[PDB]
């Protein structure tokens, strides 16, 4: 339970499905749908463009999950436990998906010889720097009023948002505007809940990084496989 888990369940699920839809499927319950490892394997194949080992019981689920872990390991990722994944351990399942997001969607981001998390932050800063009422300094409260998200969109597609009519003191509108526009026009699923952001002063960094990284991939064209489906 908890605020962190709630945000991660929403964001991670939406991110996974932005890619799984390319493979003709999707998960519908992150606490249950990776337990048999099939969808975990399919997700890895979609975002890497590589072919994993060929995929109904206990060790059958363990085997598929292990096939997924083997692939992750061959890509340099640390490594939770296969048993805990098969058993539906929420914390560990979310942690595993985060390691996948970090490795396959953020780690390889680079701007002005800066990479991974710092690279993504700098890209955000470069894109939003022109806007006087935005000041991205982190992956949490800097995005709370919603102008940052609106700025990322406006910098790439000025006709989608009338930036000058955005008022910092109406964050619900700023957030909903960016979220709806990104979903409709950019194919970036709503990974964040506007009302829930207004209700906190500590939005989850991993959830925010995940969502912003999708804007990077939607606009850069840097990594074909990471573009939203």
Q: Token pair for residue 15?
A: 């991110």
Tokens 């982190």 belong to 138
Q: Are 207 and 192 in contact (CB under 8 A)?
A: yes
Q: Are 172 and 194 in contact (CB under 8 A)?
A: yes
CA distance 174 to 172: 6
Interruptions in the chain after residues (C–N over 2.5 Å) = 55, 79
Range of the domain at 27: 1-109
List, in sequence order, every beta strand (DSSP E) within 82-146.
Answer: 110-111, 114-115
> Among residues 57, 90, 109, which one ends one of the domains?
109
CA angle at 28 for the pair 139 and 146, rounded to the nearest 5°: 25
Method: X-ray
Q: Token pair for residue 134?
A: 């935005």
Q: Token pair for residue 185?
A: 């026009």
Contacts of 202 (CB under 8 A, 6+ apart): 3, 140, 141
List, in sequence order, every beta strand (DSSP E) within the chain.
Answer: 110-111, 114-115
Q: Are 137 and 64 part of one and the same domain? A: no
CA distance 201 to 180: 22
CA angle at 4 for the pair 103 and 73, rounded to the nearest 5°: 25
Q: Taking Cα atoms as reference points, which of 121, 181, 119 lies closest to residue 156?
A: 181
CA distance 139 to 168: 18
Q: What DSSP designation does 114 have?
A: E
Q: Are 105 and 117 part of one and the same domain? A: no
CA angle at 156 for the pair 143 and 224, rounded to the nearest 5°: 95
Q: Are 132 and 26 part of one and the same domain? A: no
Q: Are 224 and 114 part of one and the same domain? A: yes
Q: Token pair for residue 47?
A: 């975002």
Q: Are 116 and 90 part of one and the same domain? A: no
Q: Are 58 and 118 part of one and the same domain? A: no
Q: 97-132 in b/e burial notation, b at 16+ Cβ within 10 A? A: bbbbbbbbbbbebebeeeeebebbbbbbeebbeebe
CA distance 51 to 71: 9
**61 three-state secondary structure:** helix
How far apart are the two ends of the chain, measured CA to CA in Å?
30
Q: Taking Cα atoms as reference points, which of 91, 126, 128 lies closest to residue 111?
A: 126
List, in sequence order, every beta strand (DSSP E) within 66-212.
Answer: 110-111, 114-115
Contacts of 92 (CB under 8 A, 6+ apart): 80, 81, 84, 85
Contacts of 158 (CB under 8 A, 6+ apart): none
CA angle at 72 for the pair 212 and 76, rounded to the nearest 5°: 85
> Among residues 109, 128, 156, which one ends one of the domains?
109
CA distance 186 to 157: 10
Q: Are 157 and 177 in contact (CB under 8 A)?
A: no
CA distance 206 to 83: 24
Q: Are 224 and 118 part of one and the same domain? A: yes
Q: Count other C-beta atoms under 10 Å from residue 208's C-beta.
A: 24
Estimate to the nearest angstrom the gap between the alpha carbon of 33 and the chain centroid.
18
Residue 195, judged by CB atoms within 10 A of its CB (0-12, 13-18, 19+), counts as: exposed
- Which CATH number does the domain housing residue 22 bear? 1.10.418.10
Q: Taking Cα atoms as reference points, which of 133, 194, 199, 202 lies closest to residue 168?
A: 133
CA angle at 71 for the pair 68 and 74, rounded to the nearest 5°: 150
Tokens 């206990």 belong to 58
Q: Are 117 and 105 part of one and the same domain? A: no
């Amino acid at each position: 339970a908890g605020h962190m888990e709630k945000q991660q369940r929403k964001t991670f699920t939406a991110w996974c499905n932005s890619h799984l839809r390319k493979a003709g499927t999707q998960i519908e319950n992150i606490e249950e749908d990776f337990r048999d490892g099939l969808k975990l394997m399919l997700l890895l194949e979609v975002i890497s463009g590589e072919r994993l080992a060929k995929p109904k019981m206990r060790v059958h689920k363990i085997s598929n999950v292990n096939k997924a872990l083997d692939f992750i390991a061959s890509k340099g990722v640390k490594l939770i436990g296969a048993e805990e994944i098969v058993d539906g351990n929420v914390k560990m399942t979310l942690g595993m998906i985060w390691t996948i997001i970090l490795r396959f969607a953020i780690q390889d981001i680079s701007v002005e010889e800066t990479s991974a998390k710092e690279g993504l932050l700098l890209w955000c800063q470069r894109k939003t720097a022109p806007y006087k009422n935005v000041n991205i300094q982190n992956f949490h409260i800097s995005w709370k009023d919603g102008l940052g998200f609106c700025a990322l969109i406006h910098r790439h597609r000025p006709e989608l948002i009338d930036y000058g009519k955005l008022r910092k003191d109406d964050p619900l509108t700023n957030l909903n505007t960016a979220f709806d526009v990104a979903e409709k026009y950019l194919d970036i699923p709503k990974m964040l809940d506007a009302e829930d952001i207004v209700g906190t002063a500590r939005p989850d960094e991993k959830a925010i990084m995940t969502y912003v990284s999708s804007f990077y991939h939607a606009f850069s064209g840097a990594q074909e496989f990471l573009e939203p489906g």
